[PDB]
Automatic annotation (TrEMBL):
Pfam families: Serpin (PF00079). SUPFAM superfamilies: Serpins. It comes from the Eukaryota. This is Serpin 4. GO terms for cellular component: extracellular space. Residues 15-361 form the Serpin domain. The keyword DNA damage does not apply.
Length: 369
C-alpha cells in the first residue's frame, strides 16, 4: 500500500526525468537511476522549508509534506536491501554542525553516513567524496563531484550511490553471439536466446515488451521495443500516456526468440535544468530555504546536482551503477529482435532502479583504454 505508492510515484518521476533528459540530449544513449536522484533530493528536502520544501515534495512526488513520513517511506525501501547495494552519505564543511532533526532523519531513516570535510581544500574534499562513490559502485562511477564546483562557500554535499550486479535467470551462450545489423546501419554483437519470458504486445503504444529476470532476486530488465525502426521518439512520448505498472501487468509468459545487443552505456549530467523544468527552481535561487540543514543561520542554496550512471549488458547478466551528488553552499516462438532503438528499465517487482535508451550503437574499430 505505502510500498505500492512509493513505486508508483517514483515511476512517474522517472518518466518525467527521462522526458526532460531526452529533450536535453536527443541522440545519446541515456542511462540514469531515478531512484538515486529522488533519494538524494528527498534527503535535501529534509532540510528545506517553506516554498522550497513544497516544490521538492510536489516535484519529486514525495509521500506527504511531513519530513518524518517522507523519511520513513525511503527507509522502508532502503532497509529491504540492507545483488543491489544502496548507500547514502553527507559530507559537511568542517566546523559546521547539522541540526539534530536533519541529522537524526538522515541517519535513522536514510541510513546515511556522515563525515566532515574541508571544502576550502576542494581537491582534497572532492577526492574524499569521489573515492567514497567509487568504493560504493565497484569503481564504475569516477570523479562524480569535480573539485571546481567546491570552494570555501560550500557547506555540504549529499550523495546517493547505487550498485547492481545480477546474473540472468537464463543466460545467453557466448558462443552463439554474432555480429548483426543494428538499424539506426551498423554491425554489433547480438546475443541470441530462446526461452519462456514474460512478454506483451502493446498495440496502443505501437510497441512490444519483454522482461528478462535475474536469478535470486525480484529484479528484471524490461525492454520496450517500438514496432518500427524509427519509432523510439514517438514511443517515448506515448509512455507518458500510460504507467510502468500498466505495462508490466500486461506481460504474460510465452516462448520468445530473443536477440539483444551486448552493449554498455555511460551518462553524466548536471540536473539543475531538469529540476527547473519540473518546477523545482527555488532550491537553486537566492530565495532558497534550507534553514533546517545547519545550526548556522547562514542562508543556503543548491549550487549543483550531478548524476552519473553506467550499465553493461552481456551474456551473463547486467552490471549497473549510478550516483547523485547535490552541492549546497551558503548564499553569497515470438521474435523479439532488439535491433533498432529501444528503451529499458531495471525494475524491482514497478519500482524502477535504472532507466535508459539505446539509440546509437557502433562496434569501435579503434583500440582504446
Amino acid at each position: 500500500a505505502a510500498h505500492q505508492e512509493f513505486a508508483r510515484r517514483l515511476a512517474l518521476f522517472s518518466i518525467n526525468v527521462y522526458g526532460k533528459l531526452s529533450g536535453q540530449k536527443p541522440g545519446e544513449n541515456i542511462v540514469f537511476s531515478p531512484f538515486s536522484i529522488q533519494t538524494c533530493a528527498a534527503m535535501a528536502r529534509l532540510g528545506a522549508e517553506n516554498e522550497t520544501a513544497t516544490q521538492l515534495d510536489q516535484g519529486l512526488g514525495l509521500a506527504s509534506s511531513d519530513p518524518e513520513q517522507i523519511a520513513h517511506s525511503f527507509h522502508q525501501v532502503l532497509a529491504a536491501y540492507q545483488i543491489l547495494r544502496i548507500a547514502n552519505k553527507i559530507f559537511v564543511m568542517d566546523g559546521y554542525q547539522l541540526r539534530q532533526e536533519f541529522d537524526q532523519l538522515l541517519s535513522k531513516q536514510f541510513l546515511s553516513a556522515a563525515q566532515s570535510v574541508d571544502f576550502s581544500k576542494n581537491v582534497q574534499a572532492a577526492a574524499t567524496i569521489n573515492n567514497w562513490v567509487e568504493q560504493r559502485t565497484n569503481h564504475l562511477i569516477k570523479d562524480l563531484v569535480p573539485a571546481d564546483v567546491l570552494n570555501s562557500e560550500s557547506r555540504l554535499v549529499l550523495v546517493n550511490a547505487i550498485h547492481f550486479k545480477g546474473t540472468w535467470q537464463h543466460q545467453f551462450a557466448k558462443h552463439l553471439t554474432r555480429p548483426d545489423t543494428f538499424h539506426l546501419t551498423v554491425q554489433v554483437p547480438m546475443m541470441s536466446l530462446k526461452e519462456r519470458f514474460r512478454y506483451a504486445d502493446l498495440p496502443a503504444l505501437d510497441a512490444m515488451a519483454l522482461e528478462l529476470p535475474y536469478k535470486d532476486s525480484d529484479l528484471s530488465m524490461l525492454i520496450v521495443l517500438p514496432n518500427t525502426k524509427t519509432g523510439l521518439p514517438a514511443l517515448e512520448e506515448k509512455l507518458r500516456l500510460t504507467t510502468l505498472s500498466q505495462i508490466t501487468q500486461s506481460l504474460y509468459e510465452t516462448k520468445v526468440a530473443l536477440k539483444l545487443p551486448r552493449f554498455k552505456a555511460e551518462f553524466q549530467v548536471e540536473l539543475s535544468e531538469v529540476f527547473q523544468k519540473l518546477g523545482m527552481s527555488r532550491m537553486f535561487s537566492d530565495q532558497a530555504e534550507f534553514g533546517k540543514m545547519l545550526q548556522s543561520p547562514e542562508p543556503l542554496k543548491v549550487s549543483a546536482i550531478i548524476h552519473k550512471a553506467f550499465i553493461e549488458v552481456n551474456e551473463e547478466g547486467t552490471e549497473a551503477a549510478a550516483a547523485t551528488g547535490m552541492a549546497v553552499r551558503r548564499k553569497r516462438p515470438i521474435e523479439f529482435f532488439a535491433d533498432h532503438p529501444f528503451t529499458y528499465v531495471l525494475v524491482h517487482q514497478d519500482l524502477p532502479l535504472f532507466w535508459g535508451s539505446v539509440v546509437r550503437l557502433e562496434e569501435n574499430t579503434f583500440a582504446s583504454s
